[PDB]
Amino acid sequence: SKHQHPVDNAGLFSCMTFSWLSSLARVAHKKGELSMEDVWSLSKHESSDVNCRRLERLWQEELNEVGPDAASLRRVVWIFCRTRLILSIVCLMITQLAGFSGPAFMVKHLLEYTQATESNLQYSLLLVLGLLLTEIVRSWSLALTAALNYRTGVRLRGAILTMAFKKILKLKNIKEKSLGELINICSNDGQRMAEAAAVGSLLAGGPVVAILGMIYNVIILGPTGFLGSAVFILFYPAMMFASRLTAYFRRKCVAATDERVQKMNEVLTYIKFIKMYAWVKAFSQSVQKIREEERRILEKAGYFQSITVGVAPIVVVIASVVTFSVHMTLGFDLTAAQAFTVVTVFNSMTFALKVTPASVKSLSEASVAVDRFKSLFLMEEVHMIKNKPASPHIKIEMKNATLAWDSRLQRTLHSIDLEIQEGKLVGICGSVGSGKTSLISAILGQMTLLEGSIAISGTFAYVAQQAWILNATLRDNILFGKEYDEERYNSVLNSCCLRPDLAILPSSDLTEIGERGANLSGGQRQRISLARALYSDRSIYILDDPLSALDAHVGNHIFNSAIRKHLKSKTVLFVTHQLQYLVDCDEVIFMKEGCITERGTHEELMNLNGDYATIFNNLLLGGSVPWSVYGVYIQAAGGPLAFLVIMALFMLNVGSTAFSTWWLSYWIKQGSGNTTVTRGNETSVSDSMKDNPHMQYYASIYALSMAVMLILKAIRGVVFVKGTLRASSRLHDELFRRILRSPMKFFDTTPTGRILNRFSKDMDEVDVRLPAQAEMFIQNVILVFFCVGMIAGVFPWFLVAVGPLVILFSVLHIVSRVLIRELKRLDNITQSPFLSHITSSIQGLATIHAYNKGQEFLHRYQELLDDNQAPFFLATCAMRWLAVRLDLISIALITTTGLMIVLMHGQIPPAYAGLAISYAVQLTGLFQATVRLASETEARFTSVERINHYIKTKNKAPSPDWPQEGEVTFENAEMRYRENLPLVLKKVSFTIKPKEKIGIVGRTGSGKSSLGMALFRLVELSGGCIKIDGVRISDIGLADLRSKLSIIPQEPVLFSGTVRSNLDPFNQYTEDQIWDALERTHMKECIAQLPLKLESEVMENGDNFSVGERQLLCIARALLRHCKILILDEATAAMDTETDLLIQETIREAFADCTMLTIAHRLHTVLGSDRIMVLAQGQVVEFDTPSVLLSNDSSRFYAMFAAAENK
């Protein structure tokens, strides 16, 4: 025994057969759920610390030997992994030698014995035992070499991830890389390296058995054997070519699918505007046009992908046909054993296309990860000041320090003579870019030194800008790895006045805040950072501006409560940006261009009449998938007929190869037509296929069988893709149709992102991932069924031997895959906390570096890495554990087939026995693929299930001229937003009459926002009646209702595409009317100067236009329709001193001859209206015209107007 982990306790046989996992497999099967407690802890050999130390030692050794610039991290990886890679390579060599010598020798000798006229029992038994032993030791050696590299990949990932984390923690240039790269390299590069070391180490595998096969087939045959090798070496860079073509088709049309996702997001977020404008048909047409363009390249991508999914038997059949059709017709002889040895070795070399491309892609990923890690390891490292001042009273000492920045020595500071003393309240103020932040960073230690010296005699309590903080509960953010003291905690809370924050928070001390703060604000974040700094109890406090945008009153209160009183015995480096915080400061310094100009306390600062005094004066002045899915999936695919057609086509595709093999066996068995050939003085029939009179007929039938197989494969490839894509298209169309027609309440309750997830992730998965795995699963299942049926046909006793084996396979399947699903779930729910403490760590590094808490952070990161890697290691080992048990069935089937062949010697033709053993040795590696494909399809069906259930859960004839007038009346309308919700409309009744300027305004939540969509009938009326032009709103069609109405929302909304498309999506309005509307809204010149003349294209939300132009575009909208009732919402504050007035001028100039149901929350912009109503809590209380309402002081509206004037 070496460790508590059963992996170390396992010897040779247990490790080879993965017997250690059958102590957790049983408990997982019995309980049905695997938790982190049941998962064994990581071994000390695979522990992060030891492997990281070894990797660092090797890296430093190579850096010292070769050089910082000429070193290679690939050499470091090779040196680290050589010990566990050499033995794995040897094991792969021996297992691939056994797997090649099995069919080449054991099958050939067995078939030669079958053709022999004698009958030997001991020899046949010895041959069967030898073949069984060879296959058993091949499978076991493969399992051993997989387990050997699985551990070293995990240990390499663990060693490199912590080293990368330490490097990014100790780097100086935080902004050198991006946010999405530092997190990716510490979370995905390690996994890429692990999977590379796991699967790509077999690069010396498939190729070596392939070249061994090429060397073979030339001794038994003649020169014809080179044609079989040429066929393989031309077919490989054809499946590779198809894979490259499908990869090129991928990452293409991704722009189209991103445009579709953006359009769906725009139609979901701005669904109120579209539903209030009847712009549904045009948007639906737009998305249909985008989708049909997407599934025009998606169809080709699927066509090219479906070629290389099941090529395992097709390549062997093609090579055999090409070899035999020219070997027989050239006069050469061919026997059953001679012909079937080539087929068996071709099937053996077939076990390269499944692994080699994956190995190459893993090696490429490992190489690019190594290059990126090397680039990470070559940047400058941050430094910490260790020199101390000669006088202990001096805290920070620096004399004539250049202290250049980086870009590299970027000169920013010049001749700084700081003499900071212990216990001071100084402040370094200056212009932006003069070197204030540069000086702060230099004090922290992230600055290089050229001339002078830097002396620090204490730790830094530095708070960073933007308040990065941590990503945990609001208790460790204040302690920051310190002992919890009640008195200190209460003092810190009282100093920073955090009691109201705790009171308003739901969980108070237990409240959880994200990396940036979800239920938090900038001021609260800064207060939390200040509290953490106060509780830190350090010597020097590097106080970066905490109150730049926090507040004034409470900011001064916390400043004079904590910085002045609590922070008296500690050094203060408070940056200052307002200049009233240094009235009590001990020494005020003002530095410009990196040089100190004024020193001393404040009194000298004003009496010297410097720049600081001028600035101060200026500032003072200023799961299981049910059967419903499978069924509906196929029902959406076209019903039972489509599934039956697909199944029949797959069976025909497999049966093409099956019939080719059967015809080859028939040609071998038929002999020379039972004719006699004169070989001299003896004439006694013949036993050579070359003497068969109908040899050309057999060759032609073989060639036709190959052609038919190719045609069937092409037909399946071009049909199955269409069948699996039409289902996705129909599902997407139905989902869009039901979502667009669904009440708005579905949008208010269900989040927009949740709906969008069904069109960006679920839809893409359904389109590209699930059909790909389903095709291979179906192909493997049909191939296995056909092989089993044909094997049983030759010997009518395979069913009785396979029945118990089928039961064993079913028992294995039900026992397993549960510890796989649970292990994957555990890996995900341990990697999510691994993304925690990583995204936060990269987001904020200056605070960590200044506080010197880089050791406990690294320890926590290593602990998280180990607790995430252990489930990953177990999950990786589970695949090989299942593969061993499935091989225990595969080799058993092969042994049973061989025993049946040897027992029935003389009653079975050699070709029939040979085909059986060829298919038996072809059965290898099929159950392992089949179960994995079934599990993957079951997992992928969760997306289809999530998509599903979403589609599950006249009277009055309007006049052609309606509305002739703009008369609006309300008859005690009763309305509510949703059921079981507080009422928003309470017996509201009023009269508008055409030609009005209603200036509706009320308190928040009173019901002002309800009006608008209330008139448009976004949700059905719960009571009351509303009449337009004497006609009730109800009992009218949706288009008729929301087609003669217009409204401009609060925030301008613009759709991506074309300006013409935004102005006229239906394309039925004349250009002259559009230009007249633009002229009336004052657009003309500034929009006519565009190079494309209004076809200039608009980005998302109109990001290429100014805010004023964005508002003016929406103002110009609804002018073309010349609608009567306008329900223009709030203008979202005033824009400048002229743009707002111009907008108002255009607004009243355009909509002058019609009603004006404008809603504005500003009392200054509502003045001059013809008549204004005031609605409070859903009741009308004031209808008497602003003017008349004004004279009356008792009216509320006058009180609000006076309050607004006062404020």
Tab-separated table of all heavy atoms in Angstrom, residues 1043-1087:
chain	number	residue	atom	x	y	z
A	1043	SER	N	-53.325	48.708	-35.704
A	1043	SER	CA	-52.872	49.156	-37.015
A	1043	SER	C	-53.183	50.616	-37.304
A	1043	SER	O	-52.471	51.227	-38.110
A	1043	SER	CB	-53.489	48.292	-38.126
A	1043	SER	OG	-52.760	48.419	-39.334
A	1044	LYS	N	-54.211	51.194	-36.682
A	1044	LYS	CA	-54.528	52.610	-36.817
A	1044	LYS	C	-54.081	53.408	-35.597
A	1044	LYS	O	-54.641	54.471	-35.313
A	1044	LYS	CB	-56.027	52.796	-37.055
A	1044	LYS	CG	-56.430	52.783	-38.521
A	1044	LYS	CD	-55.810	53.947	-39.277
A	1044	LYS	CE	-55.504	53.568	-40.716
A	1044	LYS	NZ	-54.620	54.566	-41.378
A	1045	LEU	N	-53.080	52.912	-34.873
A	1045	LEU	CA	-52.599	53.536	-33.650
A	1045	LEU	C	-51.082	53.649	-33.699
A	1045	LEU	O	-50.403	52.826	-34.319
A	1045	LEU	CB	-53.026	52.730	-32.418
A	1045	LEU	CG	-54.404	53.022	-31.820
A	1045	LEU	CD1	-54.894	51.829	-31.016
A	1045	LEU	CD2	-54.352	54.264	-30.953
A	1046	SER	N	-50.555	54.677	-33.038
A	1046	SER	CA	-49.123	54.933	-33.010
A	1046	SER	C	-48.690	55.307	-31.598
A	1046	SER	O	-49.470	55.841	-30.806
A	1046	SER	CB	-48.733	56.046	-33.989
A	1046	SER	OG	-48.960	57.326	-33.424
A	1047	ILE	N	-47.426	55.020	-31.297
A	1047	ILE	CA	-46.852	55.328	-29.990
A	1047	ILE	C	-45.337	55.346	-30.131
A	1047	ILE	O	-44.751	54.490	-30.800
A	1047	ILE	CB	-47.313	54.308	-28.921
A	1047	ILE	CG1	-46.434	54.398	-27.672
A	1047	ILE	CG2	-47.265	52.899	-29.484
A	1047	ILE	CD1	-47.068	53.809	-26.432
A	1048	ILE	N	-44.708	56.328	-29.498
A	1048	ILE	CA	-43.253	56.426	-29.427
A	1048	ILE	C	-42.831	56.049	-28.011
A	1048	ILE	O	-43.242	56.726	-27.057
A	1048	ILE	CB	-42.760	57.832	-29.797
A	1048	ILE	CG1	-43.185	58.190	-31.222
A	1048	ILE	CG2	-41.247	57.920	-29.653
A	1048	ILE	CD1	-43.424	59.669	-31.435
A	1049	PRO	N	-42.032	55.001	-27.827
A	1049	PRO	CA	-41.705	54.545	-26.471
A	1049	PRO	C	-40.772	55.513	-25.757
A	1049	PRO	O	-40.326	56.523	-26.303
A	1049	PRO	CB	-41.030	53.191	-26.707
A	1049	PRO	CG	-40.443	53.308	-28.074
A	1049	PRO	CD	-41.386	54.178	-28.863
A	1050	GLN	N	-40.487	55.180	-24.496
A	1050	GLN	CA	-39.601	56.006	-23.682
A	1050	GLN	C	-38.198	56.058	-24.275
A	1050	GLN	O	-37.708	57.126	-24.658
A	1050	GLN	CB	-39.561	55.473	-22.248
A	1050	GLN	CG	-40.643	56.033	-21.342
A	1050	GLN	CD	-41.169	55.006	-20.358
A	1050	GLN	OE1	-40.447	54.101	-19.942
A	1050	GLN	NE2	-42.436	55.141	-19.982
A	1051	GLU	N	-37.534	54.906	-24.354
A	1051	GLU	CA	-36.180	54.835	-24.895
A	1051	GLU	C	-36.228	54.512	-26.384
A	1051	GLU	O	-36.806	53.488	-26.767
A	1051	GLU	CB	-35.361	53.778	-24.168
A	1051	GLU	CG	-34.946	54.172	-22.758
A	1051	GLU	CD	-33.668	54.989	-22.730
A	1051	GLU	OE1	-33.703	56.165	-23.150
A	1051	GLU	OE2	-32.629	54.454	-22.291
A	1052	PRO	N	-35.672	55.381	-27.242
A	1052	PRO	CA	-35.576	55.073	-28.672
A	1052	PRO	C	-35.112	53.655	-28.966
A	1052	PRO	O	-34.132	53.179	-28.384
A	1052	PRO	CB	-34.540	56.098	-29.155
A	1052	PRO	CG	-34.593	57.240	-28.089
A	1052	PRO	CD	-35.639	56.839	-27.073
A	1053	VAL	N	-35.810	52.973	-29.868
A	1053	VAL	CA	-35.478	51.610	-30.266
A	1053	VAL	C	-35.229	51.603	-31.770
A	1053	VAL	O	-35.979	52.219	-32.538
A	1053	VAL	CB	-36.581	50.614	-29.866
A	1053	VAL	CG1	-37.900	50.941	-30.557
A	1053	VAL	CG2	-36.150	49.189	-30.180
A	1054	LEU	N	-34.153	50.938	-32.182
A	1054	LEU	CA	-33.795	50.810	-33.587
A	1054	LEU	C	-33.414	49.366	-33.868
A	1054	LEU	O	-32.777	48.715	-33.032
A	1054	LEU	CB	-32.642	51.750	-33.958
A	1054	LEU	CG	-32.986	53.241	-33.995
A	1054	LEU	CD1	-31.733	54.091	-33.858
A	1054	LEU	CD2	-33.734	53.583	-35.274
A	1055	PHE	N	-33.804	48.870	-35.036
A	1055	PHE	CA	-33.558	47.491	-35.420
A	1055	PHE	C	-32.374	47.405	-36.376
A	1055	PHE	O	-32.195	48.256	-37.250
A	1055	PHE	CB	-34.800	46.879	-36.072
A	1055	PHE	CG	-36.063	47.096	-35.288
A	1055	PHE	CD1	-37.031	47.975	-35.742
A	1055	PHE	CD2	-36.280	46.422	-34.099
A	1055	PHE	CE1	-38.194	48.177	-35.022
A	1055	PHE	CE2	-37.441	46.619	-33.376
A	1055	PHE	CZ	-38.398	47.497	-33.838
A	1056	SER	N	-31.559	46.371	-36.188
A	1056	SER	CA	-30.417	46.149	-37.062
A	1056	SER	C	-30.882	45.826	-38.478
A	1056	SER	O	-31.919	45.193	-38.688
A	1056	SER	CB	-29.544	45.015	-36.525
A	1056	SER	OG	-29.514	45.022	-35.108
A	1057	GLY	N	-30.098	46.272	-39.455
A	1057	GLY	CA	-30.445	46.061	-40.846
A	1057	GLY	C	-30.268	47.295	-41.706
A	1057	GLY	O	-29.157	47.814	-41.838
A	1058	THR	N	-31.360	47.774	-42.296
A	1058	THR	CA	-31.329	48.895	-43.223
A	1058	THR	C	-32.275	49.982	-42.723
A	1058	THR	O	-33.319	49.697	-42.131
A	1058	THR	CB	-31.712	48.437	-44.646
A	1058	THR	OG1	-30.660	47.627	-45.185
A	1058	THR	CG2	-31.942	49.621	-45.576
A	1059	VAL	N	-31.881	51.240	-42.950
A	1059	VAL	CA	-32.714	52.372	-42.548
A	1059	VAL	C	-34.092	52.272	-43.189
A	1059	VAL	O	-35.113	52.562	-42.554
A	1059	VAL	CB	-32.022	53.701	-42.904
A	1059	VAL	CG1	-32.890	54.884	-42.493
A	1059	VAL	CG2	-30.651	53.785	-42.258
A	1060	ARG	N	-34.143	51.869	-44.461
A	1060	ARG	CA	-35.427	51.653	-45.121
A	1060	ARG	C	-36.217	50.544	-44.434
A	1060	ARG	O	-37.436	50.655	-44.263
A	1060	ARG	CB	-35.206	51.326	-46.598
A	1060	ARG	CG	-36.255	50.407	-47.205
A	1060	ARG	CD	-35.919	50.060	-48.646
A	1060	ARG	NE	-35.821	51.248	-49.487
A	1060	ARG	CZ	-36.860	51.911	-49.974
A	1060	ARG	NH1	-38.103	51.526	-49.728
A	1060	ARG	NH2	-36.650	52.985	-50.729
A	1061	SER	N	-35.536	49.467	-44.033
A	1061	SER	CA	-36.214	48.378	-43.337
A	1061	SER	C	-36.794	48.848	-42.008
A	1061	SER	O	-37.923	48.489	-41.653
A	1061	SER	CB	-35.249	47.213	-43.118
A	1061	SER	OG	-35.761	46.297	-42.166
A	1062	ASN	N	-36.037	49.649	-41.257
A	1062	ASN	CA	-36.540	50.215	-40.013
A	1062	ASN	C	-37.702	51.176	-40.227
A	1062	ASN	O	-38.663	51.143	-39.451
A	1062	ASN	CB	-35.413	50.934	-39.268
A	1062	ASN	CG	-34.324	49.987	-38.807
A	1062	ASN	OD1	-34.447	48.769	-38.944
A	1062	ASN	ND2	-33.250	50.540	-38.255
A	1063	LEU	N	-37.639	52.024	-41.253
A	1063	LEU	CA	-38.703	52.972	-41.553
A	1063	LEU	C	-39.913	52.331	-42.214
A	1063	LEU	O	-41.035	52.810	-42.023
A	1063	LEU	CB	-38.173	54.091	-42.458
A	1063	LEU	CG	-37.817	55.420	-41.786
A	1063	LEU	CD1	-39.062	56.103	-41.243
A	1063	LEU	CD2	-36.789	55.214	-40.683
A	1064	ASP	N	-39.716	51.262	-42.985
A	1064	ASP	CA	-40.811	50.600	-43.682
A	1064	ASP	C	-40.512	49.114	-43.839
A	1064	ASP	O	-40.105	48.674	-44.923
A	1064	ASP	CB	-41.046	51.246	-45.049
A	1064	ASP	CG	-42.396	50.889	-45.635
A	1064	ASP	OD1	-43.273	50.437	-44.872
A	1064	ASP	OD2	-42.579	51.061	-46.859
A	1065	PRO	N	-40.687	48.315	-42.782
A	1065	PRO	CA	-40.387	46.876	-42.899
A	1065	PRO	C	-41.238	46.154	-43.930
A	1065	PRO	O	-40.751	45.223	-44.583
A	1065	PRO	CB	-40.644	46.354	-41.478
A	1065	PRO	CG	-41.593	47.337	-40.876
A	1065	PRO	CD	-41.221	48.668	-41.456
A	1066	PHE	N	-42.498	46.556	-44.097
A	1066	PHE	CA	-43.383	45.871	-45.030
A	1066	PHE	C	-43.165	46.299	-46.475
A	1066	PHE	O	-43.642	45.612	-47.386
A	1066	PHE	CB	-44.845	46.104	-44.636
A	1066	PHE	CG	-45.272	45.338	-43.417
A	1066	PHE	CD1	-45.596	46.001	-42.245
A	1066	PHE	CD2	-45.350	43.956	-43.443
A	1066	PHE	CE1	-45.990	45.299	-41.122
A	1066	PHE	CE2	-45.743	43.248	-42.323
A	1066	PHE	CZ	-46.064	43.920	-41.160
A	1067	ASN	N	-42.460	47.408	-46.700
A	1067	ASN	CA	-42.126	47.897	-48.039
A	1067	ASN	C	-43.386	48.121	-48.879
A	1067	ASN	O	-43.571	47.538	-49.949
A	1067	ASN	CB	-41.155	46.941	-48.743
A	1067	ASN	CG	-39.725	47.112	-48.270
A	1067	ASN	OD1	-39.043	46.137	-47.952
A	1067	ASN	ND2	-39.263	48.356	-48.222
A	1068	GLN	N	-44.260	48.990	-48.368
A	1068	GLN	CA	-45.470	49.372	-49.079
A	1068	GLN	C	-45.706	50.876	-49.095
A	1068	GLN	O	-46.682	51.326	-49.707
A	1068	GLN	CB	-46.696	48.663	-48.477
A	1068	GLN	CG	-47.337	49.380	-47.297
A	1068	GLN	CD	-46.658	49.065	-45.977
A	1068	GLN	OE1	-45.433	48.979	-45.900
A	1068	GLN	NE2	-47.456	48.892	-44.930
A	1069	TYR	N	-44.844	51.662	-48.459
A	1069	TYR	CA	-44.960	53.114	-48.443
A	1069	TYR	C	-44.037	53.719	-49.492
A	1069	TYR	O	-42.901	53.270	-49.669
A	1069	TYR	CB	-44.618	53.680	-47.062
A	1069	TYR	CG	-45.716	53.531	-46.029
A	1069	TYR	CD1	-46.761	52.636	-46.215
A	1069	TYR	CD2	-45.704	54.287	-44.865
A	1069	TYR	CE1	-47.764	52.499	-45.272
A	1069	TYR	CE2	-46.702	54.158	-43.916
A	1069	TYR	CZ	-47.728	53.263	-44.125
A	1069	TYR	OH	-48.723	53.131	-43.184
A	1070	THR	N	-44.535	54.736	-50.189
A	1070	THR	CA	-43.757	55.383	-51.235
A	1070	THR	C	-42.574	56.144	-50.643
A	1070	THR	O	-42.621	56.628	-49.509
A	1070	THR	CB	-44.634	56.334	-52.049
A	1070	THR	OG1	-43.814	57.110	-52.931
A	1070	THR	CG2	-45.406	57.268	-51.128
A	1071	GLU	N	-41.500	56.238	-51.432
A	1071	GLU	CA	-40.302	56.939	-50.982
A	1071	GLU	C	-40.561	58.430	-50.793
A	1071	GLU	O	-39.924	59.069	-49.946
A	1071	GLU	CB	-39.164	56.714	-51.978
A	1071	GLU	CG	-37.837	57.332	-51.571
A	1071	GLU	CD	-36.823	56.296	-51.125
A	1071	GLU	OE1	-36.862	55.162	-51.649
A	1071	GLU	OE2	-35.990	56.615	-50.252
A	1072	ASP	N	-41.485	58.998	-51.571
A	1072	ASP	CA	-41.794	60.419	-51.446
A	1072	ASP	C	-42.354	60.739	-50.066
A	1072	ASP	O	-42.003	61.758	-49.461
A	1072	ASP	CB	-42.776	60.840	-52.541
A	1072	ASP	CG	-42.130	60.901	-53.910
A	1072	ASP	OD1	-40.960	60.482	-54.037
A	1072	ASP	OD2	-42.793	61.367	-54.862
A	1073	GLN	N	-43.232	59.874	-49.550
A	1073	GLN	CA	-43.768	60.079	-48.208
A	1073	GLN	C	-42.672	59.976	-47.154
A	1073	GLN	O	-42.661	60.743	-46.184
A	1073	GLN	CB	-44.881	59.072	-47.926
A	1073	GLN	CG	-46.282	59.659	-47.999
A	1073	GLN	CD	-47.364	58.618	-47.790
A	1073	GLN	OE1	-47.322	57.536	-48.376
A	1073	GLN	NE2	-48.340	58.940	-46.950
A	1074	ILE	N	-41.743	59.031	-47.326
A	1074	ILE	CA	-40.636	58.890	-46.384
A	1074	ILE	C	-39.790	60.156	-46.370
A	1074	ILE	O	-39.429	60.674	-45.305
A	1074	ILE	CB	-39.787	57.654	-46.734
A	1074	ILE	CG1	-40.678	56.423	-46.913
A	1074	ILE	CG2	-38.733	57.412	-45.662
A	1074	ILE	CD1	-39.925	55.109	-46.905
A	1075	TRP	N	-39.464	60.676	-47.556
A	1075	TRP	CA	-38.660	61.891	-47.630
A	1075	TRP	C	-39.404	63.097	-47.070
A	1075	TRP	O	-38.791	63.954	-46.426
A	1075	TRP	CB	-38.227	62.152	-49.073
A	1075	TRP	CG	-36.970	61.428	-49.452
A	1075	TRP	CD1	-36.852	60.409	-50.351
A	1075	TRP	CD2	-35.655	61.660	-48.934
A	1075	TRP	NE1	-35.544	59.996	-50.430
A	1075	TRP	CE2	-34.789	60.748	-49.569
A	1075	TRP	CE3	-35.124	62.554	-47.997
A	1075	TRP	CZ2	-33.422	60.702	-49.298
A	1075	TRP	CZ3	-33.768	62.507	-47.730
A	1075	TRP	CH2	-32.933	61.587	-48.378
A	1076	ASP	N	-40.716	63.184	-47.303
A	1076	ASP	CA	-41.497	64.277	-46.731
A	1076	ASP	C	-41.511	64.206	-45.210
A	1076	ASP	O	-41.391	65.235	-44.534
A	1076	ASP	CB	-42.920	64.251	-47.286
A	1076	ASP	CG	-43.036	64.952	-48.626
A	1076	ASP	OD1	-42.384	66.002	-48.807
A	1076	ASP	OD2	-43.777	64.452	-49.497
A	1077	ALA	N	-41.658	63.001	-44.652
A	1077	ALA	CA	-41.608	62.848	-43.201
A	1077	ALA	C	-40.239	63.235	-42.653
A	1077	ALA	O	-40.143	63.909	-41.620
A	1077	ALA	CB	-41.956	61.412	-42.813
A	1078	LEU	N	-39.169	62.819	-43.335
A	1078	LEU	CA	-37.825	63.179	-42.892
A	1078	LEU	C	-37.616	64.689	-42.939
A	1078	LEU	O	-36.998	65.266	-42.036
A	1078	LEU	CB	-36.778	62.462	-43.744
A	1078	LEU	CG	-36.727	60.937	-43.618
A	1078	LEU	CD1	-36.117	60.314	-44.865
A	1078	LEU	CD2	-35.962	60.514	-42.373
A	1079	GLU	N	-38.116	65.343	-43.991
A	1079	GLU	CA	-38.024	66.797	-44.078
A	1079	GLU	C	-38.806	67.467	-42.955
A	1079	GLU	O	-38.329	68.432	-42.345
A	1079	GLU	CB	-38.530	67.271	-45.440
A	1079	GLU	CG	-39.005	68.716	-45.466
A	1079	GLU	CD	-37.869	69.708	-45.315
A	1079	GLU	OE1	-36.729	69.374	-45.703
A	1079	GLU	OE2	-38.115	70.822	-44.808
A	1080	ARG	N	-40.010	66.967	-42.667
A	1080	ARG	CA	-40.805	67.528	-41.580
A	1080	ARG	C	-40.130	67.323	-40.231
A	1080	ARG	O	-40.329	68.124	-39.311
A	1080	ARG	CB	-42.203	66.908	-41.579
A	1080	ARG	CG	-43.258	67.756	-40.888
A	1080	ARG	CD	-44.359	66.894	-40.292
A	1080	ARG	NE	-45.280	66.407	-41.312
A	1080	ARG	CZ	-46.532	66.041	-41.078
A	1080	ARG	NH1	-47.053	66.093	-39.863
A	1080	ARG	NH2	-47.283	65.611	-42.090
A	1081	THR	N	-39.333	66.265	-40.093
A	1081	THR	CA	-38.565	66.020	-38.881
A	1081	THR	C	-37.135	66.542	-38.971
A	1081	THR	O	-36.336	66.276	-38.067
A	1081	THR	CB	-38.555	64.525	-38.554
A	1081	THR	OG1	-37.959	63.800	-39.638
A	1081	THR	CG2	-39.973	64.028	-38.334
A	1082	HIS	N	-36.800	67.270	-40.038
A	1082	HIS	CA	-35.481	67.887	-40.209
A	1082	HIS	C	-34.370	66.837	-40.255
A	1082	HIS	O	-33.469	66.809	-39.414
A	1082	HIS	CB	-35.212	68.925	-39.113
A	1082	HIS	CG	-36.234	70.018	-39.048
A	1082	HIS	ND1	-36.203	71.006	-38.087
A	1082	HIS	CD2	-37.309	70.283	-39.826
A	1082	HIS	CE1	-37.219	71.830	-38.273
A	1082	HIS	NE2	-37.905	71.414	-39.322
A	1083	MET	N	-34.443	65.962	-41.258
A	1083	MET	CA	-33.409	64.967	-41.518
A	1083	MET	C	-32.648	65.267	-42.804
A	1083	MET	O	-31.423	65.410	-42.773
A	1083	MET	CB	-34.038	63.568	-41.584
A	1083	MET	CG	-33.293	62.484	-40.816
A	1083	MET	SD	-32.822	62.953	-39.142
A	1083	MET	CE	-31.275	62.073	-38.964
A	1084	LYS	N	-33.368	65.373	-43.927
A	1084	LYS	CA	-32.874	65.675	-45.272
A	1084	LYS	C	-31.361	65.636	-45.463
A	1084	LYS	O	-30.815	64.628	-45.922
A	1084	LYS	CB	-33.389	67.049	-45.715
A	1084	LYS	CG	-33.115	67.377	-47.184
A	1084	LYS	CD	-33.899	66.496	-48.158
A	1084	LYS	CE	-35.330	66.250	-47.707
A	1084	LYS	NZ	-36.066	67.530	-47.516
A	1085	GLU	N	-30.682	66.735	-45.122
A	1085	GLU	CA	-29.290	66.911	-45.529
A	1085	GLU	C	-28.361	65.923	-44.832
A	1085	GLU	O	-27.512	65.301	-45.482
A	1085	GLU	CB	-28.845	68.347	-45.252
A	1085	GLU	CG	-29.845	69.403	-45.692
A	1085	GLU	CD	-29.908	69.561	-47.199
A	1085	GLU	OE1	-28.946	69.154	-47.884
A	1085	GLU	OE2	-30.921	70.093	-47.700
A	1086	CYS	N	-28.501	65.764	-43.514
A	1086	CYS	CA	-27.551	64.943	-42.771
A	1086	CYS	C	-27.718	63.458	-43.073
A	1086	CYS	O	-26.811	62.667	-42.792
A	1086	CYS	CB	-27.690	65.204	-41.273
A	1086	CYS	SG	-28.924	64.184	-40.449
A	1087	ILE	N	-28.859	63.059	-43.638
A	1087	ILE	CA	-29.050	61.655	-43.989
A	1087	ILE	C	-28.837	61.441	-45.483
A	1087	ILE	O	-28.633	60.309	-45.939
A	1087	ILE	CB	-30.441	61.174	-43.535
A	1087	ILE	CG1	-30.386	59.704	-43.114
A	1087	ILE	CG2	-31.473	61.381	-44.636
A	1087	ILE	CD1	-29.940	59.494	-41.683
